[PDB]
């Protein structure tokens, strides 16, 4: 497992503990739910590149405490 920090446009953070092999759709959906907006209204970036629903932390090279940025789609 690793902890990822999801940083919003307003500088707020929600952190997620996920498995290295987990498809990140679940993280996207949980974050959008907590922001009260549709998942498709947001885009989630790692090092500026879009995280797909079927990407895993392992595939993206993510490490403990790495940042995911959320932007409006």
């Amino acid at each position: 497992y690793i902890k990822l920090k999801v940083i919003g446009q307003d500088s707020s953070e929600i952190h997620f503990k996920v498995k290295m092999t987990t498809h990140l759709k679940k993280l996207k959906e949980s974050y959008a739910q907590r922001q009260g907006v549709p998942m498709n209204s947001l885009r989630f970036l790692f090092e500026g590149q879009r995280i797909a629903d079927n990407h895993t932390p392992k595939e993206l090279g993510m490490e403990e405490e790495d940042v995911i940025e959320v932007y409006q789609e």
Partner: peptide, 10 residues
């Protein structure tokens, strides 16, 4: 003010 820490397990 200052937000508390939020960690969600999936």
């Amino acid at each position: 003010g200052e937000a508390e820490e939020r960690i969600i397990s999936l």
